[PDB]
Design an enzyme around this catalytic site. Structure first.
Site, PDB file in Angstrom:
ATOM      1  N   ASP A 151       0.856  -1.172   0.000  1.00 52.11           N
ATOM      2  CA  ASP A 151       0.000   0.000   0.000  1.00 52.11           C
ATOM      3  C   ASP A 151       0.910   1.246   0.000  1.00 52.11           C
ATOM      4  O   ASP A 151       1.095   1.909   0.985  1.00 52.11           O
ATOM      5  CB  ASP A 151      -0.907  -0.053   1.236  1.00 52.11           C
ATOM      6  CG  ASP A 151      -1.888   1.086   1.321  1.00 52.11           C
ATOM      7  OD1 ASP A 151      -1.924   2.029   0.489  1.00 52.11           O
ATOM      8  OD2 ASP A 151      -2.706   1.072   2.269  1.00 52.11           O
ATOM      9  N   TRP A 152       1.464   1.481  -1.192  1.00 48.40           N
ATOM     10  CA  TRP A 152       2.352   2.663  -1.360  1.00 48.40           C
ATOM     11  C   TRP A 152       1.480   3.839  -1.778  1.00 48.40           C
ATOM     12  O   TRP A 152       0.883   3.820  -2.847  1.00 48.40           O
ATOM     13  CB  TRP A 152       3.422   2.328  -2.408  1.00 48.40           C
ATOM     14  CG  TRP A 152       4.356   3.476  -2.778  1.00 48.40           C
ATOM     15  CD1 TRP A 152       4.348   4.775  -2.354  1.00 48.40           C
ATOM     16  CD2 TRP A 152       5.408   3.346  -3.744  1.00 48.40           C
ATOM     17  NE1 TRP A 152       5.400   5.461  -2.995  1.00 48.40           N
ATOM     18  CE2 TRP A 152       6.033   4.594  -3.856  1.00 48.40           C
ATOM     19  CE3 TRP A 152       5.858   2.267  -4.529  1.00 48.40           C
ATOM     20  CZ2 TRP A 152       7.127   4.809  -4.707  1.00 48.40           C
ATOM     21  CZ3 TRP A 152       6.944   2.470  -5.371  1.00 48.40           C
ATOM     22  CH2 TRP A 152       7.555   3.724  -5.440  1.00 48.40           C
ATOM     23  N   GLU A 153       1.380   4.831  -0.891  1.00 49.11           N
ATOM     24  CA  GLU A 153       0.610   6.034  -1.218  1.00 49.11           C
ATOM     25  C   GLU A 153       1.560   7.247  -1.348  1.00 49.11           C
ATOM     26  O   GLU A 153       1.959   7.846  -0.346  1.00 49.11           O
ATOM     27  CB  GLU A 153      -0.445   6.259  -0.128  1.00 49.11           C
ATOM     28  CG  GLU A 153      -1.309   4.986   0.062  1.00 49.11           C
ATOM     29  CD  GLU A 153      -2.482   5.098   0.995  1.00 49.11           C
ATOM     30  OE1 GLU A 153      -2.825   6.192   1.506  1.00 49.11           O
ATOM     31  OE2 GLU A 153      -3.158   4.069   1.254  1.00 49.11           O
ATOM     32  N   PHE A 154       1.859   7.625  -2.586  1.00 50.01           N
ATOM     33  CA  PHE A 154       1.616   6.887  -3.822  1.00 50.01           C
ATOM     34  C   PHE A 154       2.794   7.087  -4.772  1.00 50.01           C
ATOM     35  O   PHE A 154       3.533   8.079  -4.670  1.00 50.01           O
ATOM     36  CB  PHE A 154       0.475   7.576  -4.617  1.00 50.01           C
ATOM     37  CG  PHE A 154      -0.757   7.884  -3.782  1.00 50.01           C
ATOM     38  CD1 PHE A 154      -1.688   6.876  -3.520  1.00 50.01           C
ATOM     39  CD2 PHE A 154      -0.951   9.177  -3.291  1.00 50.01           C
ATOM     40  CE1 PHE A 154      -2.824   7.163  -2.759  1.00 50.01           C
ATOM     41  CE2 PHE A 154      -2.087   9.465  -2.530  1.00 50.01           C
ATOM     42  CZ  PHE A 154      -3.024   8.457  -2.264  1.00 50.01           C
TER      43      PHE A 154
END
Ligand SMILES: CC(=O)N[C@@H]1[C@@H](O)[C@H](O[C@@H]2O[C@H](CO)[C@@H](O[C@@H]3O[C@H](CO)[C@@H](O[C@@H]4O[C@H](CO)[C@@H](O[C@@H]5O[C@H](CO)[C@@H](O[C@@H]6O[C@H](CO)[C@@H](O[C@@H]7O[C@H](CO)[C@@H](O)[C@H](O)[C@H]7NC(C)=O)[C@H](O)[C@H]6NC(C)=O)[C@H](O)[C@H]5NC(C)=O)[C@H](O)[C@H]4NC(C)=O)[C@H](O)[C@H]3NC(C)=O)[C@H](O)[C@H]2NC(C)=O)[C@@H](CO)O[C@H]1O
Length: 540
Positions: free
Chosen positions: A290-293
């Site tokens: 969950d790389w934001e972003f």
């Protein structure tokens, strides 16, 4: 005559393959993976001849043997598989073997093999569904929800999910690496304590107390080696062997490290730490990124680079390669997923048509389209479609799906997001034709835990009565509540908008639905996710 019957000595009967140091705050010291548990057993003989060989049996099989040389003895041996064993001591001589009564011993391991199933009743409005649609039904559980929100793993309606995601596992790093944590009181510090003596860019646990040591149902005994969220999730895996439990790495405040992973030295250290983490915590079934972003516009205004696209695809390929290796070492299927922005401006920073080849599922974050972060341009935060008053609205679910499809992403990879919370504003004013979304606002609505955000449970429990208007916008497929006298306006998903999303998934042959966040539902949302995707009511 055969030897007298030995009496097993009172003593500890609980042992572990992965040991947890009960007076350690640094992850490096907190967990010790061994090849095998060190077990010990002692015995006395109160009546008779002590035999000439003593043996320790587990389920009838010899784990140790030695000379029997007096009326008491001790044996130390290794047990390399987790579970509960009927252990006996037998004294033998040429005339026969005489075995003690059995004593159970418990050999702990992080697949939950030592644990009873955690199979708890559905609470609140949750009703039982069979996972027989073939579609994803996912939700996130947040590590910190066990404090104020008081929402623990025994409260998850686990039979009604295919995927349970644990938010969030952090990546170690201090200054310049996790600066986005500093905006949360004590949070950055806590990570530095967990990560003490541990390289940056390796994963850790953010709150070891919540994850491993808090007393929780089914794991309350002092010498239960794994308590907190992880011990309960292990017991949940015993009850639900086919549920995929994925660790999620990142989220809004723990994503800064990803921006450094264009350096393959750091990316390789990260990937290797993920491998180590899944070998350590065997109840997990893969990893969610969950790389934001990629590209920035996340919490940290100083990160983001044109290189982030490439780094995202490389990272997924290398995670996949490591998970494929783990998978054949273990016989297990491991999954690789990612939670991504649904905004087209962020989507097209990545070649998902390429990265999809490494990924089991893409969790499209089709929520937060609008909210108290923008007091001037109001709109539905999680709608399927644009509303009638603004058919060119940029941020809708359908637009994020279509951006993915237009790159070449296969529909079946795409899991659509549903919100178990509302966002909203107060002081909304200056709107025409009784459509509050045409005004502007003066600040955030009063949230349940934080400004501008409200649990769906509280929307249903408090904001569907009294002065509140309720309107289902059938064009956008989106519910909203409005209190005219305080200009409070909340945009959320409800059973009907969820059912829209779910029919849309089935019609477009998408992958399924997922939700954030499981603690905030009263059952109506996850019930609708299940029903709307075609899952049969009832219990397998
Ligand atoms: C179209 C377009 O582009 N639009 C954009 C928008 O996208 C954009 O807005 C952003 O949108 C993205 C998605 O695109 C969102 O991200 C994804 O999805 C979720 C949102 O939908 C995200 O959820 C958020 O997750 C973060 C986690 O990083 C949550 O933060 C957590 O916040 C809580 C407070 O509520 C903190 O809670 C505290 O936790 C500590 C634990 O340390 C507890 O301490 C314990 O306290 C007890 C006492 O009670 C004590 O006894 C214990 O000792 C003590 N513990 C210890 C260890 O000491 C506190 O009690 C506890 N308090 C509470 C209240 O529980 C928590 O720590 C914090 N977590 C961390 C790790 O930081 C946040 O709340 C979530 N928000 C929501 C929506 O709920 C998620 O990150 C991400 N992933 C997924 C899969 O969903 C972004 O949220 C969103 N950002 C913004 C700003 O909204 C906007 C940009 O603004 O722009 C548009 O253009």
């Amino acid at each position: 005559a055969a030897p007298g019957k030995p009496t097993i000595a009172w003593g500890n009967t609980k042992f572990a393959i992965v040991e947890v140091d009960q007076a350690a705050t640094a992850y490096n010291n907190l967990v010790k993976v061994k090849n095998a548990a060190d077990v010990s057993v002692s015995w006395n003989l109160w009546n008779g001849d002590t035999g000439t060989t003593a043996k320790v049996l587990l389920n009838g099989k010899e784990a140790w043997s030695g000379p029997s040389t007096g009326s008491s003895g001790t044996a130390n041996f290794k047990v390399n598989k987790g579970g509960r064993y009927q252990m006996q001591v037998a004294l033998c001589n040429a005339d026969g073997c005489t075995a003690s009564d059995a004593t159970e011993i418990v050999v702990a391991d992080t697949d939950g093999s030592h644990l009873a199933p955690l199979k708890e009743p559905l609470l609140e409005k949750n009703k039982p569904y069979k996972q027989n649609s073939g579609k994803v039904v996912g939700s996130y559980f947040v590590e910190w929800g066990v404090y104020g929100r008081n929402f623990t793993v025994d409260k998850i309606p686990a039979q009604n999910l295919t995927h349970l995601l644990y938010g969030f596992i952090p990546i170690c790093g201090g200054n310049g690496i996790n600066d986005s944590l500093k905006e949360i009181e004590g949070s950055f510090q806590a990570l530095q304590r967990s990560c003490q003596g541990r390289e940056d860019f390796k994963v850790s646990i953010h709150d070891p107390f919540a994850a491993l040591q808090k007393a929780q149902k089914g794991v309350t005994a002092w010498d239960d080696p794994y308590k907190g969220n992880f011990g309960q999730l292990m017991a949940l895996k015993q009850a639900h062997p086919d549920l995929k439990i994925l660790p999620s790495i990142g989220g809004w405040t723990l994503s800064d490290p990803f921006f450094f992973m264009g350096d393959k030295v750091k990316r390789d250290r990260f990937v290797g730490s993920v491998k180590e983490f899944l070998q350590t915590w065997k109840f997990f079934d893969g990893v969610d990124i969950d790389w934001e972003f990629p590209g920035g516009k996340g919490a940290n205004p100083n990160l983001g680079s044109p290189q982030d696209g490439e780094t995202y695809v490389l990272l997924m390929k290398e995670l996949r390669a490591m998970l494929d290796q783990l998978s054949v070492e273990t016989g297990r299927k491991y999954e690789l997923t990612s939670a991504i922005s649904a905004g087209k401006d962020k989507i097209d920073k990545v070649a998902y048509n390429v990265a999809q080849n490494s990924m089991d599922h893409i969790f499209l974050m089709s929520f937060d389209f609008y909210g108290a972060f923008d007091l001037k341009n109001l709109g539905h935060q999680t709608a399927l479609n644009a509303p009638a008053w603004k058919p060119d609205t940029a941020y809708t679910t359908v637009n994020g799906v279509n951006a993915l499809l237009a790159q070449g992403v296969k529909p079946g990879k795409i899991v659509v997001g549903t919100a178990m919370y509302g966002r909203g504003w107060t002081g909304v004013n200056g709107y025409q034709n009784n459509i509050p979304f045409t005004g502007t606002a003066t600040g955030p609505v009063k949230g349940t835990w934080e400004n501008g955000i409200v649990d769906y449970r509280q929307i249903a429990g408090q904001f569907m009565s009294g002065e509140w208007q309720y309107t289902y916008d059938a064009t956008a497929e989106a519910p909203y509540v409005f209190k005219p006298s305080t200009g409070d306006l909340i945009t959320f998903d409800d059973a009907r908008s969820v059912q829209a999303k779910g029919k849309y998934v089935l019609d477009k042959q998408l992958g399924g639905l997922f939700s954030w966040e499981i603690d905030a539902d009263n059952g109506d949302i996850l019930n609708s996710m299940n029903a709307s995707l075609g899952n049969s009511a009832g219990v397998q």
